[PDB]
Design a protein around this ligand. Structure first.
Ligand code: G1I
Lengths: 50, 328, 277, 279
């Protein structure tokens, strides 16, 4: 019986367009990609490991 | 009777299909590929008794904690490659591990249906309200600890109180992995019944519940933006869901890939998704381009866990061969 | 300044020294898993291998609660207070209705080391994903109730279905299985007396015959093993061996029986390596 | 031109012994998985084979093919000492590995406990150390020296060895004869254990290859050294019996055993795993 209530809870949800969500996530992956050592390895001196 | 819930299920599915306007791959096609990525073991971390099941980066990123089936829990200093503290676990078998954002306490799970938090600076408390084995433990602060168990009920304990403050229950299958978001408000938990639902710590109600996969869900992790997360099924396919869209954004799967998935973790920028397997290799795929970029297979046995530091400097990966390789 | 690195070295040396000491202990210890079906009585052989009183009353109260027997089908007022002639019918109906406690009346263990230290322990989940976490156990004691055909798909068939789950898992691709036909005397007891023949539960029983106590029980005794052997026969290819020796109600040698079977478990494992045999 | 053609075959033998043992030795350190428990002895045998192959074998080809031992007299004696240890190591290492298989199967539940990584180094070093007492005499001491071709020791041209009858009997025993008793006895008891297991499984299940599998391990070792060491003891007691050319032919028969050693030693998926990265 709770599932009917649970489904009713999720029946009305504010939904964002998948195209809009994709673009925002793409920008979040675009503007924030600069500070990513995995994307571009830094100097062995800068990297504590190497 | 139950048809209304089935009608509601059809109504929910209709909204998601209607909300779908364009495909992620179509939008991400113009995005330039990351290219081939080669990783090496800048450190070769090893020296444990038996096969390990968990690994978790510290908040300061200097230390990592790994727990093995041998019952020995040891916190390992990545830079010096020298073990810092080795604390034995009362339970013979452990299934999960966690590290404090403050770094004061280290939490180790257990298959003995009891969760215990250890004090680095002497076990502090033992929690056993949940039934069955504990799947994943992770606590945002030194007061609230989130553990997902095999009783299909994940609850957030109070470290000071030692009792279940709230209970997030009603999940179909056994919960196998729990992931916390940087916002610390909402957390997504994955169960063995292919259902991936995101809870709210204060509300205690499943705001969204996704069931895109067919097989059991193995692990889940959030993106840095905290608006989406990725999960890996027991089937070869792993998918990423956009919370605001409540749908499966992109399906990640290679025809050659047929083995199981045991871990999942994004990068600091989130572009590079590193996915472990039972095929002794970890594959790093582009989150936006939805294509495989590079593979690494340093481990010899099945990879158990994988994580990325808060700073994002380098990735770690577990292994059932007792050798955890710190890739960079 | 640099003393910090030296200090960590001493701690690392101390940790490594302590870990090295425990390495011999862990390798010496042999780990077993007791995967037993419900009502099979795995605890009985576990007790035999190894203020209480209100323990007897709790089982009696649990049996009285099941003696729920009226729901399955004067004293009713007496039954209401607790919640005989009805007991005999309930005992007869106990074949269908589950009665864990005997009408007559992560747990661990440290088995006697003897030659080599052995610490056995057990772990009700339908998914049973916990099994896949175990791949280093030398062998798994799989206690099965022989007199399960009368109970309940029959209970024995459900127990036989465990092998399909156990062996097709492929996670335990190098772990042998030891099974005890528990309640062997009880299995013959129902078999020896006139009752519902196993042919009614297992249709192919009549076609089966004894391989090369009364023969009625003796023929029945082998058939359950043969059915269990047939599943274990296919897809073995070494490293997966079933040691099906029976187990009576009381047999103190059962602990010694495992050790003899345990030696063959390790020896066959080594012979698999180097392709010697 | 017969020597030139013969040298071509001899050239391959030196090359074969080089890569044959090195590849197994390279895999032992390249992959950490196989490095720890076993093949640690097999590396010592491989290391012993490399010394016999890369150093002792080619100079022998130079000795026979060329007019004489053009090199110095001191290195001529040095070659015999280095050759003695390498041949003594491979036989001993095979016996040590032979004990490894027997001591595990015949006494389980204690093999894992008793054997240790430090204990493996002690036994492996003891094989080399025991080889030291076999190689100490020819170089440091002069008890090796023989009037039959006595000038050969003095001459710088011919480096052929003539040894005292006392040394030949004792050295041959410590090298091949004694481990033969250990290798055969240990493996014979093993064959009983495998036979017992097969019979037990036959009774357990209503529905041998071991003899062939254990045959190659003992057969190859016997068929490559027995004709040599039989001849070695023969000439020391009966000098007129042996033919000089016959001694050299059997001498190079036993050197091929180190080249064919890896096939008996490491032929399994782990060895096949080694070829995986090198392909
Ligand atoms: C060319 N003949 C060599 C030198 C003498 C010698 C050999 C093998 C084993 C021994 O114990 C020896 O003393 C032969 O490999």
């Amino acid at each position: 019986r709770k599932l009917v209530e649970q489904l009713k809870m999720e029946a009305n949800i504010d939904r964002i367009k998948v195209s809009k969500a994709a673009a925002d996530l793409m920008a979040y992956c675009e503007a924030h990609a600069k500070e990513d050592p995995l994307l571009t390895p830094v100097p062995a001196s800068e990297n504590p490991f190497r | 009777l139950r048809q209304e819930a089935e009608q509601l299920k059809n109504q929910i599915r209709d909204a998601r299909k209607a909300c779908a306007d364009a495909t992620l791959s179509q939008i991400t096609n113009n995005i330039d590929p990351v290219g081939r990525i080669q990783m090496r073991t800048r450190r070769t971390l090893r020296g444990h008794l038996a096969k390990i099941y968990a690994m978790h980066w510290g908040t300061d990123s200097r230390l990592l904690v790994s727990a093995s089936q041998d019952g020995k829990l040891i916190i390992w200093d990545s830079y010096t490659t020298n073990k810092v503290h080795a604390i034995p676990l009362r339970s013979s078998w452990v299934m999960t591990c966690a590290y404090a954002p403050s770094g004061n306490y280290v939490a180790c799970g257990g298959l003995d249906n009891i969760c215990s938090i250890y004090n680095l600076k002497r076990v502090s408390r033992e929690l056993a309200g949940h039934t069955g084995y504990l799947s994943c433990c992770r606590f945002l602060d030194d007061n609230q600890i989130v553990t997902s168990s095999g009783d299909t009920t994940c609850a957030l304990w109070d470290i000071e109180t030692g009792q279940q403050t709230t209970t997030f229950t009603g999940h179909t299958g056994d919960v196998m992995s729990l992931s916390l978001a940087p916002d610390t408000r909402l957390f997504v938990s994955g169960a063995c019944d292919a259902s991936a639902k995101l809870w709210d710590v204060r509300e205690g109600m499943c705001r969204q519940t996704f069931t895109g996969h067919e097989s059991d869900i193995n692990a889940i992790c959030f993106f840095p933006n905290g608006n989406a997360f990725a999960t890996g099924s027991d089937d070869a396919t792993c998918r990423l869901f956009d919370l605001r869209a409540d749908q499966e954004l992109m399906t990640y799967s290679h025809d050659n890939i047929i083995c199981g998935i045991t871990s999942v973790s994004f990068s600091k920028s989130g572009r590079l998704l590193l996915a472990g397997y039972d095929d002794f290799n970890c594959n790093v795929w582009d989150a936006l381009k939805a294509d495989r970029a590079g593979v690494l297979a340093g481990h010899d046995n099945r990879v158990s866990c994988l994580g990325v530091t808060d700073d994002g400097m380098a990735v770690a990966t577990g292994s059932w061969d007792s050798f955890l390789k710190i890739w960079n | 300044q640099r003393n910090e690195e030296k200090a960590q070295r001493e701690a690392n040396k101390k940790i490594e020294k302590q870990l090295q000491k425990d390495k011999q202990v862990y390798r010496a210890t042999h780990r077993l898993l007791l995967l037993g079906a419900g009502e099979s009585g795995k605890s009985t052989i576990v007790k035999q291998m190894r203020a209480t009183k209100q323990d007897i009353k709790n089982n009696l109260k649990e049996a009285i609660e099941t003696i729920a027997a009226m729901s399955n089908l004067e004293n009713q007022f007496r039954v209401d207070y607790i919640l005989d002639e009805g007991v005999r019918a309930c005992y007869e109906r106990s074949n269908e209705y589950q009665l864990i406690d005997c009408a007559q009346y992560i747990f661990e263990t440290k088995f006697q080391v003897d030659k080599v230290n052995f610490h056995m322990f057990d772990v009700r989940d339908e998914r049973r994903k916990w099994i896949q976490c175990f791949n280093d156990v030398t062998a798994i004691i799989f206690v099965v109730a022989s007199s399960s055909y009368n109970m309940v798909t029959n209970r024995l068939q459900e127990a036989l279905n465990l092998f399909k789950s156990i062996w097709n898992n492929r996670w335990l691709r190098t772990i042998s299985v030891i099974l005890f036909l528990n309640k062997q005397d009880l299995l013959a007891e129902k078999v020896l007396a006139g009752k519902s023949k196993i042919e009614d539960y297992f249709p192919e029983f009549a076609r089966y015959t004894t391989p090369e106590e009364d023969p009625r029980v003796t023929r029945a005794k082998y058939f359950i093993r043969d059915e269990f052997l047939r599943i274990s026969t296919a897809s073995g290819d070494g490293r997966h061996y079933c040691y099906p020796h029976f187990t009576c109600a009381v047999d103190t040698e059962n602990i010694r029986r495992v050790f003899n079977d345990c030696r063959d478990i390790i020896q066959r494992m080594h012979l698999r390596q180097y392709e010697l045999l | 031109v017969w020597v030139v053609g013969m040298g071509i075959v001899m050239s391959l033998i030196v090359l074969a012994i080089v890569f044959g043992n090195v590849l197994v030795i390279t895999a032992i350190a390249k992959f950490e998985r196989l490095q720890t428990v076993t093949n640690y002895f097999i590396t010592s045998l491989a290391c012993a084979d490399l010394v016999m192959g890369l150093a002792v074998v080619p100079f022998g080809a130079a000795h026979i093919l060329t007019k004489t031992w053009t090199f110095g007299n001191f290195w001529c004696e040095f070659w015999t000492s280095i050759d003695v240890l390498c041949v003594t190591a491979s036989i001993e290492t095979l016996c040590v590995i032979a004990v490894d298989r027997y001591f595990a199967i015949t006494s389980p539940f204690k093999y894992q406990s008793l054997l240790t990584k430090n204990k493996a180094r002690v036994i492996i070093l003891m094989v080399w150390i025991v080889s030291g007492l076999t190689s100490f005499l020819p170089i440091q001491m002069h008890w090796y020296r023989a009037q039959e071709a006595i000038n050969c020791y003095a001459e710088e041209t011919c480096c052929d060895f003539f040894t005292n009858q006392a040394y030949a009997i004792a050295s041959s025993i410590v090298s091949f004869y004694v481990p033969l008793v250990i290798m055969v006895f240990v493996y014979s008891r093993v064959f009983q254990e495998a036979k017992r297991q097969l019979q037990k499984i036959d009774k357990s299940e209503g529905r041998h290859k071991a003899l062939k599998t254990l045959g190659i391990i003992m057969g190859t070792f016997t068929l490559c050294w027995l004709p040599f060491f039989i001849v070695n003891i023969v000439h020391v007691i009966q000098d007129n019996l042996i033919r000089k050319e016959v001694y050299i032919l059997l001498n190079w028969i036993g050197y091929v055993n180190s080249g064919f050693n890896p096939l008996i030693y490491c032929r399994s998926p782990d060895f096949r795993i080694a070829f995986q990265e090198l392909l």
